[PDB]
Design a protein around this ligand. Sequence first.
Ligand SMILES: C[C@H](CCC(=O)NCCS(=O)(=O)O)[C@H]1CC[C@H]2[C@@H]3[C@H](O)C[C@@H]4C[C@H](O)CC[C@]4(C)[C@H]3C[C@H](O)[C@]12C
Length: 1189
Amino acid sequence: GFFQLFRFSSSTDIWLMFVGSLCAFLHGIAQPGVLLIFGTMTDVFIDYDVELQELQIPGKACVNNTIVWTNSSLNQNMTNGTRCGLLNIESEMIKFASYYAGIAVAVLITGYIQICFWVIAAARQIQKMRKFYFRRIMRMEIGWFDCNSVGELNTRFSDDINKINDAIADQMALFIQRMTSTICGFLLGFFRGWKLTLVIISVSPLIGIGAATIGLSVSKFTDYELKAYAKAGVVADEVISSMRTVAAFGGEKREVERYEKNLVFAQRWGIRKGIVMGFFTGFVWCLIFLCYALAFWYGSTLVLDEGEYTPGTLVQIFLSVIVGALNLGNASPCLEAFATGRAAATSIFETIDRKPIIDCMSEDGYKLDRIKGEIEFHNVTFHYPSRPEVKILNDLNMVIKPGEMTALVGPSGAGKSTALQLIQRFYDPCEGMVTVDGHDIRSLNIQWLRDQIGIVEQEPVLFSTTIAENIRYGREDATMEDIVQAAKEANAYNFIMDLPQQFDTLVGEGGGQMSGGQKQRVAIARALIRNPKILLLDMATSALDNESEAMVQEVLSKIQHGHTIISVAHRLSTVRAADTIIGFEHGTAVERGTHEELLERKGVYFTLVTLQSQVRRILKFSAPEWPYMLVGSVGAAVNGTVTPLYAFLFSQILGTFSIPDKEEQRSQINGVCLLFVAMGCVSLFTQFLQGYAFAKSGELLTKRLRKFGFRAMLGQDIAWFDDLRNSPGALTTRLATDASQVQGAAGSQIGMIVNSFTNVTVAMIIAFSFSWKLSLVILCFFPFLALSGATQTRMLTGFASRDKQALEMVGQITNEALSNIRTVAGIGKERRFIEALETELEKPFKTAIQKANIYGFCFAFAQCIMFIANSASYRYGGYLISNEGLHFSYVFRVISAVVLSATALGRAFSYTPSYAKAKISAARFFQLLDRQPPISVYNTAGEKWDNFQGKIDFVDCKFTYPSRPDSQVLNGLSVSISPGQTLAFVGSSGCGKSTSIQLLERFYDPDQGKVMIDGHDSKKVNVQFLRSNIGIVSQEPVLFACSIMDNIKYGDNTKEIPMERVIAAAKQAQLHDFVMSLPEKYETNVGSQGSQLSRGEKQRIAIARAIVRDPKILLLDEATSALDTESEKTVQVALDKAREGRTCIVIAHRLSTIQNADIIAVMAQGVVIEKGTHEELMAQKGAYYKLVT
Ligand SMILES: C[C@H](CCC(=O)NCCS(=O)(=O)O)[C@H]1CC[C@H]2[C@@H]3[C@H](O)C[C@@H]4C[C@H](O)CC[C@]4(C)[C@H]3C[C@H](O)[C@]12C
């Protein structure tokens, strides 16, 4: 439901929410209830004006004035009784500035009570929710985490509770205002004008639709639009991910052709936002003005013939229906944010109440003492909750006698530690209970059983605080006198002193991490500090370095003894001196004997050891966009001068109820109400054209800015694609967002400084040409009224982003306590990681109690400054009409021209994608748009005409990675060769041999050591020739998302794409049958959805790709990287057949690749050592001579 969002409401918060919604009702009645004053005011003027104008002439009243000039002072001589000084303006406007500025205190002390009493009363519940959700994540099973992610529960803790801090906080408080000035807006019409506020409310739906889908559509056309781009969003991050290969063949000029074409699906999905949000602010201003035509014309029928309405009753019951139906369509952007909250909190409310299978809590269980540790395995069967079909364990029958070690030898991965996770109960066995010295492990205290065991994981993980209190996390009672004994035993004793400081070191996660074989020496001390009765080590030496490998084995083999240890073996020569080895092949322990017990048999480990123990620019860049920023701007003056002109038509009609002669009004009031229709054919025609041509010009820029962007982003070097500041994660999510913040510097910004420049300076003509004296008073409020329309938005969105940097501190303690949940629940308790959330969840509560009372006073004072502006004015306005000759009609004109052109300064002013975040957003693009790269395809392109003939040479080539400074100098190397021959590098696997031939591809550059072609200076040979006459194949497979032929099509970049080698390269590269063994011929889509062919299958495309070409140098850079013993073998024929015209460098990392091709030059430092052939490495050391050694 919806009133389930308030489920966590306490009693101090259901009372801080009633008086914050009594004073929200009682605010919303002000704005259509202030027209009651304004409608008995434009009538008290107009009776003063009628008598004063009739006082002027001595016409029909020949021998007299009416009662004026001593007829009400004589002996009862009042022939009419009314025309006197009996209406005094002095004594009357002091009585309508009392009222009009007594609302502006009780709309100031109840607009800081409707918004400082809800945003307290929401952020006092989301503290109680977010704290309570996390208390019952940490009690779920382990297997519940195995089917719910950790990077997804970290979004449903911060980005999905903050979607129900909008359906409670102010969008409830700002809705029981905007739906009680509709119930009190329209119904305050039917109180008076029941036959006139029906001929207006019969057009009130057709404004109530249009005011809705202005505010609602901007919050709807974001994700409606953000996904129409992303068809381009893969073609960008395909190539930028696969950048080596597209630049391997030179196919760059036809790789903006897949990004010139495929961009138009958002080139016309953002035009279409310009109409639909620009036409609809015309179709409220075509409907207000035409409603004024139908209210004034039809209303002037009644007010003149019946007399049943008075002229102040007539401007009061349609200015209560306009502001009565503005809010009803301005509460719909506030009722979208309930159905967003109500439908995105059903995940949280389903996690709070599942009541898990195993608590990891204390009370509900059974307690046992003096534990021997008779560990038992009765006949289990066991699925995962992730993969529920595979049977990991089957009828597993084995015992563990207490006091000694016990091994576990699986083949590779059958029951390695899944058998062992049950003894600490991360999973219940579905059949076959297991028992511990009598009583079983189910129906016992989880917080007692998890005290006795002690786990040592595969990979170490350490928590963020001090290493002397990280070991404290097991056995909470222990002190520094007792901590120090375990770090002694677990080899941290020299790591006391070599460490920067003695036992306070934060940098276990904080400053700088230790080595992978070193954190484990902490984790042994963590499990040993608790005085455990069970040790459980599951591949402690799984993946760590060979030095401390043998060092931590000394911790376990030589030192560790005394009680029950259930262990496994990474290598079993360590456990060769132990008690029992109960290894198995599948789910059932078979052997249970020592190594001499399986000398006589085969079993599970004797079988194993037979084979293992052997600013001006943005305009000038948009210079072809001149007709769509001048007919877009002529259409932005002529509806910027509509608001100021309206103040002159509306205040014209209001003086024309005062003229005495009856035929003149019905002629005159029918004249001015005809002008409102003509301002309904204009201010829709030019509110269309101010939202169309400023959104073709903001979309014919950002289409041509992307295509120029991706011609330069493609045509640069590899040396910064691998750079840290711009990786392909950020080099394609820049190009989506930053290309859209660059329309807001040219297109829709000249529709602001000429919208709100003709809006203001035609208002100051009207405001000063009629009475300058009354326009000094009100213009003293022109700063406080325009600038207050856009100072809460710049406050608020700069004050959600100070919550985020107060809540990212919470997103630390979460993510270090869900990503490693198997180590939290295994060691002691998670009480510590619950209790360290309440202490960190006060801190985003103190910056949402300071979004109460600085979003009170920027919202109360943003709303009583236009009710005090109508009180300093008309107080002084009454001073003018009485003793000066400023007649009545000019006071509604001076005031409606500098309030309507003050709000529509700011209201227009917040339609700006901010100019400061475009110039700092365009400047991060022009440097890309004109960068000078060190080597380039778009450079001097005429140094060629050398037929290669395989005389390619090295002379002592040094090399660096300038983007990854691991070393500083790779050693020089000098190799020359003859055509049709092989260099055949084998040697250093780390930056030694593949890198020294990926250098030969012009991807990186020689640090020194000039290479040659035919005595040529290779940097003075252009890349378009040189990169054409070669051909590579990648180590790892990476192709496109196209079909089979479309990558063999891709084998040339400029040349005539062959169909005659489609037949030949299929049979030359071993795939002429595999292209036929598929059910289809060409439609085998290789990346998108069709076939997830294996690495041995997928490479067979790639050898076929370059073999269509006619190159001089082959680059067989580490193929046959698959262990698939026939797919590895079959592809070897492809590398061996492609010869005879190929000056190759085929590496032969393994023995199966050919060794008798030619010489070997490289070695461990990248030095030309042992230059001779295969038959010369027998005297000295060799690679084959090392693997036999
Ligand atoms: C006079 C109306 C409400 C009065 C008001 O603002 N109340 C508080 C101060 S006081 O009581 O007028 O003293 C205002 C409120 C909203 C206004 C409308 C909105 O601003 C929308 C457009 C704006 C255009 O510039 C003019 C037509 C118009 C359709 C406006 C006509 C008129 O000025 C309205 C209907």
